[PDB]
């Protein structure tokens, strides 16, 4: 219940700004269907079906000490939130409906009050809220009205909306999973084994014709807009270079001659032959990680493969 927003150049959270929130409700993704009805047949063909948009709603109110200040506070809200600038929203929850604790009415152990006139139930460090999950959402704002209930309390009804892709982009790459350097950004929503360096954590293999990958993301990383990015030290010289993959298509690189120690950066629908001067004419096919086991099969025992990606959720 804070509605964190990471904008291009800053980080903001509402309750820091005197802005309590009632709740956050996140719709699912609007499935746009594409059916076609045959003329006299009791059944209609599915041309397609496709996720579109994940409309968020967040009603937030605010109290202040005096009626004038309402105006300022409201303006702050707009200047703080209503941003066409695609932002990264992060949801927050509490772990408990906190109450005031027992005290002693002996002219001592009195109660605290926040900067806003409320009772601080958060006595200890471990009371305040948490990033409930290690993911974000690429988000933009839609119109709000501000009904002023009595006093200094005024409500607002934010209506956020997904920007590019209706998915729960996981923050942090898969290499931070590999190297346990960055802390946070890994919630139990992702069923992740502790065996760092073990299987289903590793995306850095060496000297293999074929290997195994566990894509922890329920949603499939077929869309190029996702940050799926591979880089391979090819290991062995060749004239052509095929690699296959399951839950995806076959990939070739024919017609250009390579060398062993040369490396390929295989970005989404894009191929850096040696990091620059992209040679992407050969078999334009992009790979697709669906969920769980995504087994790959090279053909000449690359001396290194490693690939970072982002986990996406539905």
């Amino acid at each position: 219940d804070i509605e964190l927003t990471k904008k291009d150049g800053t980080v903001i959270k509402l309750s820091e700004y005197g802005f309590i929130v009632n709740d956050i409700v996140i719709d699912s993704m609007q499935i746009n269907t594409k059916y076609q009805d045959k003329e006299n047949m009791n059944g209609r063909i599915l041309m397609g079906s496709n996720y579109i948009s994940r409309d968020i709603v967040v009603p937030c109110f605010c109290k202040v000490k005096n009626r004038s200040d309402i105006a300022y506070m409201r303006d702050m809200l707009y200047s703080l939130t209503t941003d066409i600038e695609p932002m990264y929203l992060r949801e927050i929850r509490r772990k408990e409906e906190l109450n005031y604790r027992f005290t002693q009415p002996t002219s001592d152990d009195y109660v605290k009050l926040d900067k806003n006139n409320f009772p601080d139930y958060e006595y200890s460090r471990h009371d305040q809220q948490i990033y409930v999950n290690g993911k974000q959402y690429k988000v933009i704002f839609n119109g709000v009205i501000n009904p002023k209930q009595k006093g200094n309390k005024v409500s607002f009804e934010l209506k956020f909306e997904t920007t590019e892709l209706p998915y729960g982009e996981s923050i942090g790459t898969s290499l931070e999973l590999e190297e346990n350097k960055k802390v946070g950004l890994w919630s139990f929503d992702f069923n992740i084994d502790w065996h760092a360096g073990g299987d289903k954590r590793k995306y850095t293999f060496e000297n293999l014709s074929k290997g195994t990958v566990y894509y922890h993301g329920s949603a499939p990383n077929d869309q190029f807009n996702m940050y799926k990015k591979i880089t391979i030290i090819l290991g062995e010289d060749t004239e052509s270079f095929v690699w296959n993959l399951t839950h995806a298509e076959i990939m070739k690189i024919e017609g250009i001659k390579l060398k062993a120690g040369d490396r390929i950066v295989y970005d989404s629908f894009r191929v850096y032959k040696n990091g620059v001067e992209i040679s992407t004419e050969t078999n334009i096919s992009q790979p697709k990680f669906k969920y769980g086991a995504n087994k790959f099969e090279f053909n000449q025992t690359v001396q290194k493969v490693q690939f970072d990606l982002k986990f996406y959720y539905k």
Binding site: N225, E281, N283, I284
Partner: protein, 177 residues
């Protein structure tokens, strides 16, 4: 294509018929033959002929393009370039050339969308150019009379045959002397 200007069918001048590779499965068809021609050599008569062939099995790909600015910016489409398209679930990975492009630019010269056509420019635009050529070639003339046309053409043609008859008379009368 080498018979003289005054013959028109006594088919001297490199009589030949060619065909493409796909013929053998489709079979016997043929287009309007290369009747008009004053070209001597035979090297020409195969090039122009196969060009008349391969221009006709027409493929117009009037796809739509949508510009990505934050990503893939290095795709400013320009006409008369090579491009490698590939549509899955279509049976298509070949490369083609642009023949038409259609840009829009609101303000700051930022693009909003593109439209393009590949290979031949369209079926559509071919029809429309045909119509407009008809409608402008006509009304540029002056012989046209919508009420009973062909007086202007039949007067001419009958005059031509009449002078040919007079020329026949002259030929006989001169060969007499």
């Amino acid at each position: 294509g080498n018979y003289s200007g005054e013959e028109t069918f006594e088919h001297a001048g490199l009589v030949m018929e060619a065909r493409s590779a796909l013929a053998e499965i489709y079979g016997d068809i043929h287009a309007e033959p290369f009747k008009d021609g004053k070209v001597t050599d035979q090297e020409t008569m195969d090039k122009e002929l196969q060009s008349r062939l391969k221009k006709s099995l027409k493929q117009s790909l009037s796809l739509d393009f949508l510009v990505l600015r934050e990503s893939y910016p290095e795709a400013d489409p320009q006409p008369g370039d090579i491009v490698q398209i590939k549509s899955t679930k279509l049976g298509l990975n070949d490369l083609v050339r642009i023949v038409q492009v259609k840009t829009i630019r609101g303000i700051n010269n930022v693009i909003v969308k593109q439209d393009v056509t590949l290979g031949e420019f369209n079926r559509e635009q071919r029809y429309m150019k045909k119509v407009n050529t008809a409608a402008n070639y006509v009304s540029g003339l002056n012989d046209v009379n919508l009420s009973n046309p062909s007086k202007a053409a039949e007067n001419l043609k009958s005059k031509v045959a009449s002078i040919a008859k007079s020329t026949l008379d002259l030929m006989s009368r001169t060969d007499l002397i």
